[PDB]
Amino acid sequence: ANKVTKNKSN
């Protein structure tokens, strides 16, 4: 889902 990203649980 569905681009290249970085996720985030800060």
Add this chain to the structure above:
Amino acid sequence: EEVNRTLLQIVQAFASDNQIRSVAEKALSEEWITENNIEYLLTFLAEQAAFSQDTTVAALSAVLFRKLALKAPITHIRKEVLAQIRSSLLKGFLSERADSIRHKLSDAIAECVQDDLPAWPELLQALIESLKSGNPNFRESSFRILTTVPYLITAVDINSILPIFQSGFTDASDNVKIAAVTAFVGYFKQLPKSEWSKLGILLPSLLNSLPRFLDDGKDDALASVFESLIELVELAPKLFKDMFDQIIQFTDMVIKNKDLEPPARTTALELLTVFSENAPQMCKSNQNYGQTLVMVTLIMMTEVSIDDDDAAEWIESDDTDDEEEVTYDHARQALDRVALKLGGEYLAAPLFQYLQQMITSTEWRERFAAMMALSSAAEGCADVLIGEIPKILDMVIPLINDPHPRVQYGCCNVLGQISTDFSPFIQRTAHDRILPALISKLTSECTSRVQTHAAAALVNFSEFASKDILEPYLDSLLTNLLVLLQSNKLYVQEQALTTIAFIAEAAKNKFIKYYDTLMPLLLNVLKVNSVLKGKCMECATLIGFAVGKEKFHEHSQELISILVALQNSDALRSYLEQSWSRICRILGDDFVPLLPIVIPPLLITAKATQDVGLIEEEEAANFQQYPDWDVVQVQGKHIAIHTSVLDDKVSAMELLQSYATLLRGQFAVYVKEVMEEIALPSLDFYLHDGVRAAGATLIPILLSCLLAAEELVLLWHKASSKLIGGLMSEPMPEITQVYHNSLVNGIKVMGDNCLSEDQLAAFTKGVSANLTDTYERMQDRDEYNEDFTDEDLLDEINKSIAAVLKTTNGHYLKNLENIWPMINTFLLEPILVIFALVVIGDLIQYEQTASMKNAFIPKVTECLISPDARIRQAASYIIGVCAQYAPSTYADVCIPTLDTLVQIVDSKLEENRSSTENASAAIAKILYAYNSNIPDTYTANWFKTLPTITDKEAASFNYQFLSQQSNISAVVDSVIQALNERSLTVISSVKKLLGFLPSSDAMAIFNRYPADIMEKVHKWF
């Protein structure tokens, strides 16, 4: 005796059946929690918890007492009874109880200690002695009470409390240590900073106690301590300054010990990371931090596909993250977080020292780690890396063909990440390298996971690539992605579709020639896997918007018929809504016949209610586990709110808003309904600010739709009044701003005299409460520690006041007087100053301000020469506006300052080109008002401030004044420049001047001008 078995029966009924248990619940709430029975009830529950031989009764009562003792509250309980309750609680605590009951007793005891409550020195004595007990549970429980009631720490003699904690940190029992650490941090949590220095000195004992956890192999307990330490870093980072290297080195040592379980290692990383977020200067002043941080995240990033060198399991799975790769995920987020805080200046060097080397390792995990680390760091390190982009591709692109497929995916990842993070410059300059690289991975030669990720990275790239850059690559992009469309794997098809969609979005009209091949393949997929269909309709309608309505018309009817089938037949629902919305942008007014299909479902979603569960202390946290829920404490109690549902309400509101925006008058039939059932109720959604804001932006757009097509007047009255009312209640500054903006836009729509006198008065109070609470929050911004939000709000308050002035046609001056004290305080901290000046400029626009000439010109004249451009700007505009609307009550000021203005003028630089343009206009205003009464150098000074290209209203005056030698070429150009820059009849004046010169002299002036602006010049003269 009677009271006891009534209550005993009740509390025992609690565990159990609905009947016996509901009777008890009502009995408690309706009969026992009343002015008359409360103390008996509290007395009972305290006695049970203290003395009951039954575990469950004791436990429950302790909990109930805790809950009810707040609500009572403990303050209105008679002294004799407080004392008795205290004494029995205490005796229970000191008796023989199960651990969990002593915990609950401790919590109950805490409710009986309070600033206003009588001293309880028997507790103090009990705590001190319990801390020295040989029973861990007594020791632990005492620190727990000092955690709930940190004020007790202040009450004990300093020379007793210090060794208490030092013994605590060092205790044989892990539990006791964790509680000591918890109590120690809790103190800083709860007490004023002026109290901090009293325990701060204990930090080194605490830090020095930490290597013991590794000796004994107690890493779970280490993790808990790390969690307390993380809270302390957020509160008092500078306390760590002197021992900074020791804690850095310690977290390093833990993370590297990879026989430890993950929690100790992830929390240690978090500890390291959080310094960057709370003490950036501290991190930056120590080269050790950055080096440690990079090194440990690089180690953790290699912890993937363990025991599976071929990655078989990874190759075989879908394109989601593996939830078992926890330390890897943690490492990535950490590097990202620190890079974003500290910048590339500081991290690029240490980062790259390592990457150069890992790219060349024979261990694949390290070559991967390298790519993912770059990916994480590139945004935060952009300030440096954005310039060294060929060098970066020289490292990465060779790896695109690595023997290992996971290294390949890794390289696709970087090309994706940087296409976003260095956009739009990378699209312009590296397309010739990046696209061929990604395109080569699309071939079915490569692994599913790689083909997919390369296609994902083409979304990143496309998002910021102009149609012209993508053009020569489209046929190639497309033929490849069609093959991916024919995959056996669902996630490959879904990716294929999304990549085509986004490429078509970027390609626009250049995609028209691909439409005939794509569209049938897409229709076939739909006519046949919910997400596939959704992504497919998304791909279809984005293609539709790209190619335009005429081309879209070859399949629109069939497409529409399939959508209808689809809609009426859960992630699909949202793709359906967006697609319909996109069709409305394509079809324009031809959509109107489809409103009865599309709007009803949107009305349902946008009518979502604030889904709240009035909830219990314990019953939270686990409710919090769900991404789709949150819990907060608002006014004492706990509330569970369904967040996702409210996000969806917003999304629906944004679609209704966009239909209303495109359809204008044609949406009018829905305005009353959406206004009363959706926009307006949304302002009362105190638990979700998105809703409140979305409600606000809907208002002016709804009005404008009905306008274009009595009711209107009613609705506006209702809407404006709830907007206004929101100003004195709304807690979130960012929302307050939306309301003012919303009023501005409302007023702009509704026109002349759209507000009534009471509304104007109610607005003023709101404006004042807003100013008051902004002041209060800002007078809060150290020994222990290292806000456009506020600026933005004040920016908009300016606009609403201005807007209100205009609609009232001046009359708002009256009401505006009540907040003059407020205004005045602001006038004499830069943001509040700017605000004040801006207000005053608006005031003068409507010589009835003489009452205050003396109160502000002293500060305005000061501000004229301020180091701050924004202050000079606002100031000069004020002095210029003085000579415009108040010519005579101001002369003694305007003409003196006039020399100041010739100097402030001298500047012509992007950041302050605006400020100097206002001054320029301000002097042209003075030259106008007092025309032949002036001691004339001036006008020729002013001229040299031309052209005016940035401020439009300023430019408007200057060329009006200009319209009333061999300056001729500078005269003309001054005008061409304003026109061409689109900042501003002065043309008429100019043509006459050119009349006064020969054929050849006239022509020659434009000889300097390029073709494109000579096109414009011909069409201007």
